[PDB]
């Protein structure tokens, strides 16, 4: 299935994934496409942050779902 990742800058990334893929594996696919090391990725979906060792289906991530790649900002 196809899912989408939107960055905080507005960029959309398209990923081919299976329901049973781990979050670690989705992050590896993001690293290939974007260069961001998995440890620096914060993915959020439907009020949850996606953690390693769980699967997409654990978070009810469906086909055509959008995940948000988000950031922490330093200014204040």
């Amino acid at each position: 299935m196809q899912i989408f990742v939107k960055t905080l800058t507005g960029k959309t990334i398209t990923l081919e994934v299976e329901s049973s893929d781990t979050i670690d594996n989705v992050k590896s696919k993001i690293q290939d496409k974007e260069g961001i090391p998995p440890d620096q990725q914060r993915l959020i979906f439907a009020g949850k942050q996606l953690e390693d060792g769980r699967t997409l289906s654990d978070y009810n991530i469906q086909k055509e779902s959008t995940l948000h790649l988000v950031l922490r900002l330093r200014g204040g």
Partner: protein, 972 residues
């Protein structure tokens, strides 16, 4: 555009947007908390004029969120009272009161009309229709307790000039095939997305491809994209730089009337997407209720009125069938809470929408960023305390004739009193700090007999701060941030008099005597208001150590985030990593720049060397007997010496020759323009430079000398001080410029004597004045030098030159910042703060927030639970647990204690960077160590203030294997 006021905001919006905003007249209807908050952010940002309309009399309950109202204003008109206080925010912005809006045709004078919660739905429809049909931008917003909405209608044809505000992508090209497949140089990522547009420069063999023509991008992996056929353009030879171009987008908005029946939503929270359509009917039902009950909203906590609102929503879903869609029921419980809270006026919610709506105003003026299209609904129902702890009914939520009545309306009297009795520490008194303190003033947080606020900041108020730190005025420049902010919020809410301790101390390892065990232990929680990652890490480690909740937040232009850290529940701030700042290769800096960032960093280092380090090294050489390879050469140059300003000019002219002519010739001697590796040496990132021939009519050449001379004159105490070209010519024209002679024995890296010095005896009393880099003083020549110096090197390497504003951004390391995002994220922090007050232990109630107002995007996620671990089947919290050890224990006893109590063999013991014990140590080292108390053991390897010592350990479990274990705290 006044750079000295608008500096930080200019980096968010750009000159063109701010020029357009400065032609825009804005009208705001309604000046309760929501209207004043929007007005504050808009006035600070700088529009042509601000007009406010609110002829309603001030009542006590208005002060819940209206921070410009005082108890003495009661009876007077909201508009009139607020106008004078708004005017103070930005002297460049005229603030007027509209006395009546009898004629809807008066609206013709304005570019943007904002209707707040004082305007009926009926009137909003009429006003919107006038605006839409006349080409006037219309925005509305209303907040009702923990709920809120906004509607944007920018008319039939609105042009977005820049959808995101992100820096355009650029990159180096190594190939363009005839089908238009563009390959990136080496491992450079293009970062482009399908449907982006690029233009080209320096693509040899395809000539007209470089004329500014735009090409649509089809992405084929991270190192390639296609632009379609290029056969007709020629054949690709070498080189090339793509630059992303943002194309204009025409967008169409529907009128409020059409959008009431068929709304288009942006979601605030995807976990709650279903609620948006429910609240859309809810908010409409509230207006219908007010129509039926002589202008009155539902009674607070009233079950009878709630049932009427539910019936109103049920009836409206029939009239508006496309809102909920087929088979979807009225969410009765949600509508019930809306009715229950309708009269509420909550600071956090007011701040969230105040920030967001103000940004939408700025978009409507400028065509900068993507407008909200067209409705957004928000709730923060998780902020509600457990009804078991603080019951909500008509008795507990009743007015007690108090400024807090419309907060009591939501939370009840007892919860309100608990807010008052909180003891809090705020680290930082800048943008976030000011917004925080205002919010806390409005809450009456720390005003109760058991409560207080401690705010600390070491910094003073500067002009550029005033654009986003709204508690400060031009009169306050030079005074301390914390002290001024404390006084300003006491004037806003007298309940805080004698309750804020404004300190000027910098939180860090060096002020632990002030911020000691006693100080932290007393606190209920800590709030960050910082601008530095290390500062945040430091505070986070203290909150972990003392087991205190931390409220974290941050901004960068239109981007923002909030994080909650809860003892024994969540991970902390330091538990996760953010992208590090990217490091430029040393060889790229030294010899091979290809971006303005490279020439700026080189110029800044040169600035440092010439005017700071040089002066310091001389001063140390002349006063320090101990003093005695690059350093030595600088001292001799500094001391073999100007007697007047003319000598400083000569020196800078000669530096020009050295840096931008001689050194370049030397590099080209080593690597001629034609040199080859197969391929040419000067390709991709390596751009074949050309030596500069000094031309005083070139602005960069001229200002290098002016600023270099003026700075050298400062070093040597020579009187300095627009510069005249002919005056400088009358020095330079008479100079003999030494010819270049190549050093044959100089190696240049491709990829990443002593008694000549004069006797300090002969130069007694002589001292150099070192320059302290000051980016925000445009008269000191600092940015002038760095800009000119960078630009001359940019000229060497055919890099496009930058102006002073861009150079200052990069060399000054300035964080883009604007009041809109600041007030919004602070609002979100205060909605989490309610959960801390109720001591919520359910992780699913808390929300970390993530925003980008440019898009606009709002997203929330539940915090990550603290990772748990085990040793010898004993479970522990990897963030929150530690081994507490009483007394200055002897090493052997410590080792004994861990074997006996924990079943752990200590394999390694450390204090900071010092290793204290290891299981591989030999008997001789062990004998001098094992019988010492920890302080003495630390003394052997290397203070009275110190009450605790933190130790790190590696350990093996009972079954012999290594095991992750928490730190040790020795209590002395």
């Amino acid at each position: 555009i006044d750079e000295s006021l608008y500096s930080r905001q200019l980096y968010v919006l750009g000159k063109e947007a701010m020029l357009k905003m400065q032609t825009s007249n804005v009208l705001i209807l309604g000046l309760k908390g929501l209207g004043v908050e929007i007005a504050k952010n808009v006035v600070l940002a700088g529009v042509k004029s601000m007009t406010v309309f609110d002829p309603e009399p001030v009542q006590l309950a208005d002060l819940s969120t209206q921070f410009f109202l005082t108890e003495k204003d009661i009876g007077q008109k909201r508009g009139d009272v607020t106008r004078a206080k708004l005017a103070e925010l930005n002297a460049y912005v005229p603030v007027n009161v509209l006395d009546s809006l009898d004629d809807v045709t008066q609206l013709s004078q304005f570019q943007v009309v904002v209707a707040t919660d004082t305007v009926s739905l009926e009137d909003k429809v009429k006003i919107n229709e006038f605006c839409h049909s006349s080409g006037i931008r219309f925005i509305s917003s209303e907040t009702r307790g923990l709920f809120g909405n906004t509607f944007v209608d920018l008319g039939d044809e609105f042009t977005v000039l820049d959808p995101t505000g992100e820096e355009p992508r650029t990159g180096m090209v190594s190939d363009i095939e005839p089908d238009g497949t563009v390959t990136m140089l080496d491992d450079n990522r293009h970062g482009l997305e399908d449907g982006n547009f690029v233009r080209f420069s320096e693509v040899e063999g395809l000539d007209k491809l470089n004329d500014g023509t735009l090409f649509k991008v089809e992405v084929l992996g991270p190192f390639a994209f296609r632009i379609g056929s290029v056969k007709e353009y020629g054949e690709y030879k070498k080189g090339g730089i793509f630059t992303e171009v943002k194309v204009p987008r025409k967008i169409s908005f529907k009128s409020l009337k059409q959008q009431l029946s068929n709304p288009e939503f942006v979601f605030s929270d995807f976990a709650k997407f279903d609620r948006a359509a429910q609240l859309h009917l809810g908010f409409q039902a509230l207006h219908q209720f007010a129509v039926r009950h002589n202008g009155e909203l539902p009674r607070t906590m009233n079950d009878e009125d709630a049932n009427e609102l539910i019936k109103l929503v049920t009836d409206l879903s029939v009239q508006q069938p496309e809102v909920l869609g087929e088979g979807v029921d009225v969410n009765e419980d949600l509508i019930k809470e809306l009715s229950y809270q309708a009269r509420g006026d909550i600071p956090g919610v007011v701040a969230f929408f105040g920030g967001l709506v103000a940004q939408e105003v700025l978009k409507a003026c400028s065509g900068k960023f993507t407008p909200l299209k067209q409705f957004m609904y928000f709730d923060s129902l998780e902020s509600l305390p457990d009804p078991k702890n603080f019951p909500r009914n008509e008795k507990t939520t009743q007015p007690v004739n108090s400024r807090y009545d419309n907060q009591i309306a939501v939370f009840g009297l007892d919860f309100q009193k608990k807010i008052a009795n909180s003891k809090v520490f705020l680290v930082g008194s800048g943008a976030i700090g000011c917004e925080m303190l205002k919010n806390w003033a409005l809450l009456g947080l720390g005003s109760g007999s058991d409560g207080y606020i401690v705010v600390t900041d070491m910094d003073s108020i500067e002009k550029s701060n005033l654009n986003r730190q709204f508690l400060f005025r031009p009169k306050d420049v030079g005074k301390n941030k914390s002290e001024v902010a404390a006084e300003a919020v006491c004037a806003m809410n007298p309940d805080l008099k004698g309750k804020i301790n404004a300190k000027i101390d910098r939180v860090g390892p060096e002020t632990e005597e002030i911020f000691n065990d006693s100080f932290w232990e007393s606190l209920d929680f800590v709030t960050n208001a910082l601008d530095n990652v290390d500062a945040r890490t430091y505070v986070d480690r203290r909150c972990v150590f003392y087991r205190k909740p931390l409220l974290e937040s941050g901004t960068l232009g239109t981007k923002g985030n909030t994080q909650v850290i809860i003892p024994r529940l969540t991970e902390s701030y330091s538990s996760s990593r953010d992208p590090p700042e990217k490091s430029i290769p040393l060889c790229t800096l030294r010899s091979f720049p290809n971006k303005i960032d490279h020439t700026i960093a080189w110029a800044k280092s040169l600035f440092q060397g010439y005017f700071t380090d040089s002066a310091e090294n001389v001063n140390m050489y002349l006063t320090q007997p101990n003093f005695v390879k690059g350093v030595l050469e600088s001292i001799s140059d500094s001391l073999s010496k100007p007697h007047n300003f003319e000598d400083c000019i000569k020196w800078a002219r000669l530096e020009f020759e050295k840096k931008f002519n001689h050194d370049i010739k030397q590099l080209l001697f080593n690597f001629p323009k034609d040199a080859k590796t197969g391929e040419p040496f000067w390709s991709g990132a390596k751009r074949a430079p050309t030596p500069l021939e000094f031309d005083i009519y070139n602005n960069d050449h001229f200002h290098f000398v002016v600023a270099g001379a003026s700075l050298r004159a400062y070093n040597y105490g020579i009187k300095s001080d627009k510069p005249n070209v002919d005056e400088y010519k009358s020095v330079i024209d008479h100079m003999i410029i030494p010819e270049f002679t190549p050093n044959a024995n100089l190696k240049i890296q491709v990829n990443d004597l002593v008694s000549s010095l004069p006797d300090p005896s002969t130069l007694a009393g002589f001292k150099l004045e070192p320059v302290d880099f000051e980016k925000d003083d445009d008269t000191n020549h600092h940015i002038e030098f760095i800009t000119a110096c960078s630009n001359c090197r940019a000229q060497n390497y055919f890099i496009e030159t930058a102006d002073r504003q861009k150079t200052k951004f990069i060399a000054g390391r300035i964080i883009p910042a604007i009041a809109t995002t600041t007030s919004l994220v602070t609002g979100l922090v205060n909605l989490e703060l309610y959960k801390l007050i109720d001591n919520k232990t359910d992780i699913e109630q808390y929300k970390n927030g993530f925003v980008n107002l440019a898009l606009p995007f709002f997203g929330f996620s539940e915090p990550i639970a603290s990772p748990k671990g085990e040793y010898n089947n004993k479970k522990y919290d990897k963030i929150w647990d530690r081994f507490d050890i009483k007394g200055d224990i002897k090493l052997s006893d410590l080792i004994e204690h861990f074997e006996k109590d924990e079943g752990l063999e200590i394999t390694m013991l450390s204090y900071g960077v010092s290793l204290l014990y290891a299981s591989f140590f030999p008997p001789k080292k062990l004998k001098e160590r094992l019988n010492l108390p920890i302080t003495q053991l630390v003394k052997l390897v290397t203070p009275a203030h110190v009450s605790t010592m933190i130790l790190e350990i590696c350990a093996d479990d009972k079954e012999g294997e290594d095991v992750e274990v928490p730190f040790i705290t020795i209590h002395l």
